[PDB]
Amino acid sequence: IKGGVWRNTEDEILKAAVMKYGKNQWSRIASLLHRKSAKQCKARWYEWLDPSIKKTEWSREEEEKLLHLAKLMPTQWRTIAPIIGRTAAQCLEHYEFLLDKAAGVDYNAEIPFEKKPALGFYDTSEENYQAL
Amino acid sequence: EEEEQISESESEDEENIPYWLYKLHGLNINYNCEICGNYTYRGPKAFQRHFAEWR
Amino acid sequence: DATVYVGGLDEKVSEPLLWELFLQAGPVVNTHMPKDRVTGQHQGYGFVEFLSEEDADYAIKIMNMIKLYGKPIRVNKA
RNA sequence: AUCGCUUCUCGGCCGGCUAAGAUCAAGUGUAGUAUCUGUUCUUAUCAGUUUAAUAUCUGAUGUCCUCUCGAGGAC
């Protein structure tokens, strides 16, 4: 019931919330949005919205590396995805794309505690000061 | 050079994008006011503004 | 002549007392009195587009009698 | 007096530890409106529908003949 499609409003508000609160507090960020939970917010951050994620075409090297690795460790996408530097869902889609296109008074009264200054080789007798 | 001779000859002896926007708004459509120099106006709002003008 | 340049003003003046001020003579159709963004205040010089040119030449004749904040107001053709 | 370094002085811009301490609220449907975002018409002319006028929609690119869209001739 809570599940559904992601909205530009929810997604931008997710950007701002993640910016303000920080990465480790999910319940606080899920509190602001409606119809979405904390798990969904976190996985939605790390899966897609995260700026460190690389959204662009795959170069030739990334295709060589992806194909080789996928033939090395079949069906393991969460192991391969960090090695090529792409999202697991993304490299999946691209792979099926490659096979697809490959064929109180202490203050104010009396001076709290008083230290009269000590007296030294000079005359302080005379000195007094003006009012305000 | 010929240009120069000519000028000397005929000179005083003593010198002193929104394409559908303009259709929607009704502009860049050919129109004419007769009383003013048989003038051309490209918009109906503009010609309606001609009614109050200096010229 | 449809437009005039107006110098020597005080920022408490705005586009409104110019509106009101020069339409006392004849209506200002297009008003321009810059708002400076950086320090949010006016240098006090103006540009005025009228209905046609006759308005503005009479405006050259009459126009420089205005005195904004006890002080002199420049109006010339443009 | 000047240059450089330094000292002092002044002015202008100018929230402790723990198991992260623990935990974490959503009604529905019938009608209907508003407000955001994205995308499309340089088409030339005429005829009709249509409009307050636009807009929009709907149709074709002076005629004939000859030769290989072009050329010539007769209007």
The sign one gets for the Cα dihedral A116, A119, A125, A131 is negative
Q: How far is Cα C69 from Cα C17, in angstroms, rounded to an integer?
A: 11
Q: Which residue type does B20 have?
A: W
A102: part of which helix (H) or strand (E)? helix A88-102
Q: What is the CA radius of gyration of chain B?
A: 21
Q: Which residue on chain B is closest to C54 by alpha carbon? A: B54
Same domain, residue pair A38 and A61: no
Is A64 a domain residue? yes
A110 part of a folded domain: no
Specify the number of domains making up chain A.
2
Residues A68 and A42 in one domain: no
Strand D reaches within 7 A of the A9 CB: no
Final residue of a domain: which of A36, A53, A70? A53
| Residue whose token pair is 């008003």 | C31
| Residue A9 sits in the same domain as residue A33 | yes
**C55:B52 CB<8 A:** no
Same domain for A48 and A58, yes or no, is: no
Residues paired with residue C6 on neighbouring β-strands, in sequence order: C46
Tokens of A48: 């897609």
Structure method: cryo-EM
In this structure, is residue A132 part of a structural domain?
Answer: no
Residue A118 forms part of a structural domain: no
Extract the tokens encoding C56: 């503005």
Q: Is residue A92 part of a domain?
A: yes
What's the gap in Å between the CA of B52 and the closest CA on chain C? Answer: 8
Q: Token pair for residue A77? A: 């996408």
- CA A24, distance to chain mean position in Å, is 7
Nucleotide closest in space to A28 (CA vs C1') = D24
Q: Do A58 and A32 fall within a single domain?
A: no
Q: Are residues A33 and A70 both part of a single domain?
A: no
Full domain range(s) for residue A67: 54-103
- CB < 8 Å to C50, chain B: 54
Instruction: Find which of C30, C50, C52, C55 to mutate to test the B interface (most B CBs within 10 Å of its CB).
Output: C52
| Alpha-carbon gap, residue B27 to B21, rounded angstroms | 8
Q: Based on the domain organization, do A43 and A68 belong to the same domain?
A: no
- 3-state SS, chain B, equals CHHHHHHHHCCCCCCCCCHHHHHHHCCCCCEECCCCCCCEECCHHHHHHHCCCCC
Closest-CA distance, C9 to chain B, in angstroms, reads 29
Answer for B43: CB within 7 Å of strand D: no
Q: Say if A131 falls within a structural domain.
A: no
Q: What is the signed CA dihedral for C35, C36, C41, C47, rounded to 10 degrees?
A: -40
